[PDB]
RNA sequence: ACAU
DNA sequence: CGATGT
């Protein structure tokens, strides 16, 4: 199996897990950063991975692009397929922001359509995803 | 076990 | 070493 170079790759970065969460999307071929989310004070790795995919979907749909999205997160890929982020993170004042973003991402999935293939980046074969936070 |  | 997830 070969890398689909005409694609968008996304990844999360964090300081702590749970901790400060950010994510970005890059052109898989060139590494050009196409979007980056301002750090969110408290979230989980998987919430960030999920938000990154959904933002990718919205970014590609707005631009009428049929490119696939790569993510290395088995969890987030499934959450997007289910349109449901099954996170364990407590809901409190500290986590309100990330939970609002997650709820709104689910809502977007439940009110829009897309054909974008969401593909597993095969880290064991190909190395780190091109959006990785080194 | 697998993926982060 | 710890945590998030299927
Ligand atoms: K585990
Ligand atoms: Mg990742
Ligand atoms: Mg990474
Ligand atoms: Mg890392």
Name of the CATH architecture: 2-Layer Sandwich
Assign the CATH superfamily: Ribonuclease H-like superfamily/Ribonuclease H
**SSE sequence, one letter per element:** EEEHEHHEH
Question: What's the arrangement of strands in the largest beta sheet?
Answer: 3-2-1-4-5
Structural class, by secondary structure, is alpha/beta
How many β strands by DSSP?
5
Bound molecules: potassium ion, magnesium ion
Q: Give the C-level CATH assignment.
A: Alpha Beta
Helix content: 25-40%
Name the overall outline.
globular
Distance between the termini: 25 Å
Largest sheet: 5 strands, mixed
Instruction: Compute the number of structural domains.
Output: 1
And the CATH topology? Answer: Nucleotidyltransferase, domain 5
As a whole number of angstroms, the C-alpha radius of gyration is 14 Å
* Total of helices: 4
Classify the beta-strand content into a percent band.
25-35%
Describe this structure in words.
The structure holds 1 chain of a larger assembly. This protein has 134 residues and is of the alpha/beta class. It has a single domain, classed as 2-Layer Sandwich (Nucleotidyltransferase, domain 5). Helices cover 35% and strands 26% of the residues. The protein has a five-stranded mixed sheet. α1 packs across α2. The chain is globular and about 45 Å long. The site of one magnesium ion has 5 residues, from β1. The protein binds a DNA/RNA duplex (4 and 6 nucleotides) through α1 and α2.
């Amino acid at each position: 199996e070969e890398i689909i170079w005409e694609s968008l790759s996304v990844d999360v970065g964090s300081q702590g897990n749970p901790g400060i969460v950010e994510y970005k999307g890059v052109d898989t071929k060139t590494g050009e950063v196409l979007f980056e989310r301002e750090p969110i004070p408290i979230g989980t790795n998987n919430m960030g991975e999920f938000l990154a995919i959904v933002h990718g979907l919205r970014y590609l749909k707005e631009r009428n692009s049929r490119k696939p999205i790569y993510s290395d997160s088995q969890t987030a890929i499934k959450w997007v397929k289910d349109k449901k982020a099954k996170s364990t993170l407590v809901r409190n004042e500290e986590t309100a922001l990330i939970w609002k973003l997650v709820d709104e991402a689910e809502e977007w999935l439940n009110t829009h359509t897309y054909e974008t293939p969401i593909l597993k980046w095969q880290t064991d074969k190909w190395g780190a995803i091109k959006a990785d936070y080194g």
